[PDB]
Amino acid sequence: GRMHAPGKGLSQSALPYRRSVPTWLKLTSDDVKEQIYKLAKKGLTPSQIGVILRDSHGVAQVRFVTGNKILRILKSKGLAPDLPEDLYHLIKKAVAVRKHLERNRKDKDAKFRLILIESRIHRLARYYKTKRVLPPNWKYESSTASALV
Amino acid sequence: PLAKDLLHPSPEEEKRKHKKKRLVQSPNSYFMDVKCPGCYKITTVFSHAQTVVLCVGCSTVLCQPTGGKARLTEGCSFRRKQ
Amino acid sequence: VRMNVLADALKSINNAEKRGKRQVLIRPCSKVIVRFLTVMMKHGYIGEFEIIDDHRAGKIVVNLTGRLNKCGVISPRFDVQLKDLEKWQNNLLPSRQFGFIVLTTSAGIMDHEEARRKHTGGKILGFFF
Amino acid sequence: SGALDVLQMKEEDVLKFLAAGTHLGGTNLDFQMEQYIYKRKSDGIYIINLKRTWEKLLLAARAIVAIENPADVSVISSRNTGQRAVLKFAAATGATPIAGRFTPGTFTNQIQAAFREPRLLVVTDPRADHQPLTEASYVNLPTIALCNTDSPLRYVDIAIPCNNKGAHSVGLMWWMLAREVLRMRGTISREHPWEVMPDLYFYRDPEEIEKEE
Amino acid sequence: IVKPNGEKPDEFESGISQALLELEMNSDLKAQLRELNITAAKEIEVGGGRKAIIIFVPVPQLKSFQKIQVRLVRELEKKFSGKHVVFIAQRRILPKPTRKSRTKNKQKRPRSRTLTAVHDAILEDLVFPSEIVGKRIRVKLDGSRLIKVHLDKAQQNNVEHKVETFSGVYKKLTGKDVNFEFPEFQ
Amino acid sequence: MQNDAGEFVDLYVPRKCSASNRIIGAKDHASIQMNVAEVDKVTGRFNGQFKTYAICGAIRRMGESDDSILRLAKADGIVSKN
RNA sequence: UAAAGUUGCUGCAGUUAAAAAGCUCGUAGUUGGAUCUCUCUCGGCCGAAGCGUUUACUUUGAAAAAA
């Protein structure tokens, strides 16, 4: 179930058994990679890149075409985001909640939600520091969070 | 029922099941080629697309985002693949 | 969350056998589950089973000959020496005439009698009778 | 049937089933009766697969024929709809009928006057004839029941999927069971139609006849 | 064309290489065969009296070799009458490390070079024109395993005769019994 | 049920359910032993032979006696297919 | 001390008999999914032949007063 919610939803993606490039996809590996580079240069996260390639270019799974994952491709090319996308969005949400709390101090539910979001941020940051994606000196601050976003 | 054959379920039963609870999971979605009356190329659209897909050679909209399957515009022929 | 997928497999087999069903679906599958099932099948307790190969983790359909009184797991996997095997098999087995204690051993996953034959101990995985 | 050409269902039997409304189930379906239906109609009625109906009827006949004493088979009916059908089946086949009230303890209480020890039990409706079904579980008594789409299958060992609501259908099925039992024994042959038409088994509802007369 | 690492081509390998060279000398697909080469070739018996040709191909070339797979296979079958022919990529299996590991074996074993992955890829390309859409493993009471592969239904026509040649090849170079059935409906 | 010499030492050998292979206890009065008459292939008449199916009371209680007996009959060729 | 499975590791309880924190977060703790089958001394039968990342485990073999 959800880490910070009582819900236990089953909704997710179901990858098909076949790992081969679909017959309708005439795009080559280098064509898909160039598409990924162009989308990344627009400032799109790998999730957005995958969604756009799925919804418009017929790319069912970038991994099965290019043999590599979107973040791995962007890291190889060298234009990957400094801090990982999920951590970036968690920090963005925490900054938004703190900005809201600055003007609404009686919003105790917002305070509870901020506590939960910051706990998620700390768990993700600890994981990333374990894997050396983030420097060991990296620390999320309640006073200087809006500089990482 | 006791002796329910769990190895070879009916295709109707497998289509009834949740996509993840199937014997081997398979998506309920598909990729479909849309052809427009005023276009020379066929555009592949996800059945459950989240983006607003414009015409590959025009400004005509192809599909609209929706809670589930994308809503195709009226006037463009969509054919399912595989 | 789910730890000890072997525990889930054995409990599902137990509940299916109690319900009288002829087949049980076990997911996820694993190497330890397959070896335990092979140990159970070599003694005629379950019969033939099949591994449904997803591309993520296994599934298994186990045919159920109505012979299994009980298959269970021991958690944690206590380390068992040969001199201490009799005490375990006196606590866990209904008789000295039937029933097996499964141990994972440097020589493989196998029942306590064959562990005695190979003169070896290991870690107790479970039991079935 | 046993995949036997002689025991396969014939056209006249199918027309009798369709005229009687035998294939018409009900709005509700029991989860243990799903294997006996074909599909649900647009009016919410389940269609009963007549091939499975014939298979279960012949299985019940095979069960009844393997009882050396004809009186050892007891045929029950509590609803008046199947009472005449049960009486006629008992007269034709040699079974013992219980038409009307079934006194509890008829199988389990040996002091009662009506105490009996059947070797086989055939009931019309498992829901209406639930008491003989429950008492058959005290005396090792296997049971045959004419079950509808919504009929519970507890203590029912051979269920014959059929409309057990309409008088025509239940009378026809008791007539068919009698005919199959006699054919399987040897009395009456399979190469000529039975001289008894099924109307001898139908509940009459005397008001209809009296207003017609 | 043929280029064994042991530098000892055989009569059958040389014959296969010269047949491929001839196919270069007159065909409509010469341009692709210029770069392509093979590692080895073997003749095996699938069962009864029939035989199979197994052409081992360098892995990077395999995909390109699969582009012209159907045409070249048909040509080689025509040159070899009733002999079925199959293209297998030559993949090496690094042994599972134990507490005996030397300087070369210091580098961690790639997953693609494990026995499981290599056998799965061998099975995948052994049926190449047909795609594997399912797999089951049946464990018999004696403990033996039988693999049942479900191939694509729409490609059944040109691979059904190849069944029992696929199984023989797999049992030869892999050592596991395999059956090639087709799903009732995909 | 055997001893070292080889003689059988049990008082008796209880029946097993034909649907579950579990032992039918000596006080299972809800259990049945259905006798199903066998039929000559040509004439369709009771030929004196029968197939015997013992069903425990647990199966009859859960409503599975119907399907269990149907499966047993189908396996024996008494009940046809479809 | 056993009886005491009335201290419960084996092996107890926690709806109403005694009992689940008002509720969440959360560090330590505990527990965690599938997956990987030569020998830089060589001499015309003998030895400088390697905890070969490691540990836990298991099976050895030493060594370990008597009473």
UniProtKB/Swiss-Prot annotation, chain C:
Compartment(s) where it occurs, according to its Swiss-Prot or TrEMBL record: Cytoplasm; Nucleus, Nucleolus
Single GO MF annotation: structural constituent of ribosome
UniProt name for this protein: Small ribosomal subunit protein uS8
Keywords: Cytoplasm, Diamond-Blackfan anemia, Nucleus, Ribonucleoprotein, Ribosomal protein
Quaternary structure (record): Component of the 40S ribosomal subunit. Part of the small subunit (SSU) processome, composed of more than 70 proteins and the RNA chaperone small nucleolar RNA (snoRNA) U3.
Originating gene: RPS15A
Purpose: Component of the small ribosomal subunit. Part of the small subunit (SSU) processome, first precursor of the small eukaryotic ribosomal subunit. During the assembly of the SSU processome in the nucleolus, many ribosome biogenesis factors, an RNA chaperone and ribosomal proteins associate with the nascent pre-rRNA and work in concert to generate RNA folding, modifications, rearrangements and cleavage as well as targeted degradation of pre-ribosomal RNA by the RNA exosome. Required for proper erythropoiesis.
Biological-process GO terms, alphabetical: cytoplasmic translation; positive regulation of cell cycle; positive regulation of cell population proliferation; response to virus; ribosomal small subunit biogenesis; translation
Family to which this protein belongs: Belongs to the universal ribosomal protein uS8 family.
Organism domain of life: Eukaryota
Keyword Transcription regulation: no
Origin species: Homo sapiens
A cellular component annotation (GO) from this entry: small-subunit processome
Residues with the N6-succinyllysine modification: K87
Swiss-Prot record, chain D:
Processing and modification events after translation: Acylated. Acylation may be a prerequisite for conversion of the monomeric 37 kDa laminin receptor precursor (37LRP) to the mature dimeric 67 kDa laminin receptor (67LR), and may provide a mechanism for membrane association. Cleaved by stromelysin-3 (ST3) at the cell surface. Cleavage by stromelysin-3 may be a mechanism to alter cell-extracellular matrix interactions.
Positions bearing the site annotation: Cleavage: A114, F115, P132, L133
Numbered residues of crosslink Glycyl lysine isopeptide (Lys-Gly) (interchain with G-Cter in SUMO2): K88
Alphabetical UniProt keywords: Acetylation, Cell membrane, Cytoplasm, Disease variant, Host cell receptor for virus entry, Host-virus interaction, Isopeptide bond, Membrane, Nucleus, Phosphoprotein, Receptor, Repeat, Ribonucleoprotein, Ribosomal protein, Ubl conjugation
Residue positions where N-acetylserine is found in the record: S1
Span list, region Laminin-binding: 160-179
Compartments in which it is found: Cell membrane; Cytoplasm; Nucleus
Residue numbers spanned by region Interaction with PPP1R16B: 53-112
N6-acetyllysine: residues bearing it: K51, K88
Coiled coil: none
UniProt record, GO biological process: antiviral innate immune response; cytoplasmic translation; ribosomal small subunit assembly; translation
Residues with PTM Phosphoserine: S42
Superkingdom assignment: Eukaryota
Annotated positions of the Phosphothreonine modification: T96
GO cellular component, one term: cytoplasm
GO molecular function: DNA binding; laminin binding; laminin receptor activity; ribosome binding; RNA binding; structural constituent of ribosome; virus receptor activity
Family statement drawn from the similarity comment of this UniProt entry: Belongs to the universal ribosomal protein uS2 family.
Protein name per the record: Small ribosomal subunit protein uS2
Entire protein: shown range: 2 to 214 of 295
From Swiss-Prot, chain E:
Location in or out of the cell: Cytoplasm, Cytoskeleton, Microtubule organizing center, Centrosome; Cytoplasm; Nucleus, Nucleolus
BP terms from Gene Ontology: cytoplasmic translation; negative regulation of ubiquitin protein ligase activity; negative regulation of ubiquitin-dependent protein catabolic process; neural crest cell differentiation; neural tube closure; positive regulation of gene expression; positive regulation of intrinsic apoptotic signaling pathway by p53 class mediator; protein stabilization
Glycyl lysine isopeptide (Lys-Gly) (interchain with G-Cter in SUMO2) crosslink, residue number(s): K63, K67
Residues where N6-acetyllysine is found: K67
PTM entry text: Phosphorylated by NEK6. Ubiquitinated. Deubiquitinated by DESI2, leading to its stabilization.
Assigned GO CC terms: centrosome; cytoplasm; cytosol; cytosolic ribosome; cytosolic small ribosomal subunit; endoplasmic reticulum; focal adhesion; membrane
Residue ranges of the TM segments: none
Main location: cytoplasm
GO molecular function ontology, one term from the record: RNA binding
PROSITE patterns per UniProt: RIBOSOMAL_S7E (PS00948)
Keywords: Acetylation, Cytoplasm, Cytoskeleton, Diamond-Blackfan anemia, Isopeptide bond, Nucleus, Ribonucleoprotein, Ribosomal protein, Ubl conjugation
InterPro entries xrefs: Ribosomal_eS7, Ribosomal_eS7_CS
Family to which the UniProt record says this protein belongs: Belongs to the eukaryotic ribosomal protein eS7 family.
Its job: Component of the small ribosomal subunit. The ribosome is a large ribonucleoprotein complex responsible for the synthesis of proteins in the cell. Required for rRNA maturation. Part of the small subunit (SSU) processome, first precursor of the small eukaryotic ribosomal subunit.
Gene, per the UniProt record: RPS7
Curated annotation (Swiss-Prot), chain F:
GO cellular component: cytoplasm; cytosol; cytosolic ribosome; cytosolic small ribosomal subunit; endoplasmic reticulum; nucleoplasm; rough endoplasmic reticulum; small ribosomal subunit
Residue(s) of cross-link: Glycyl lysine isopeptide (Lys-Gly) (interchain with G-Cter in SUMO2): K41
GO MF entries: RNA binding; structural constituent of ribosome
PROSITE patterns (alphabetical): RIBOSOMAL_S21E (PS00996)
Alphabetical list of Pfam families matching this protein: Ribosomal_S21e (PF01249)
Localization of this protein: Cytoplasm, Cytosol; Cytoplasm; Rough endoplasmic reticulum
Main localization of the protein described in the UniProt heading: cytoplasm
Transmembrane segments: none
Record key words, sorted: Acetylation, Cytoplasm, Endoplasmic reticulum, Isopeptide bond, Ribonucleoprotein, Ribosomal protein, Ubl conjugation
BP GO terms, sorted: cytoplasmic translation; endonucleolytic cleavage in ITS1 to separate SSU-rRNA from 5.8S rRNA and LSU-rRNA from tricistronic rRNA transcript (SSU-rRNA, 5.8S rRNA, LSU-rRNA); endonucleolytic cleavage to generate mature 3'-end of SSU-rRNA from (SSU-rRNA, 5.8S rRNA, LSU-rRNA); translation
Modified sites of kind N-acetylmethionine: M1
Keyword Translocase: no
N6-acetyllysine PTM positions: K81
Keyword Cytoplasm: yes
Assembly and oligomerization: Component of the 40S small ribosomal subunit.
Function: Component of the small ribosomal subunit. The ribosome is a large ribonucleoprotein complex responsible for the synthesis of proteins in the cell.
Similarity section: Belongs to the eukaryotic ribosomal protein eS21 family.
Protein name, per record: Small ribosomal subunit protein eS21
Gene designation: RPS21
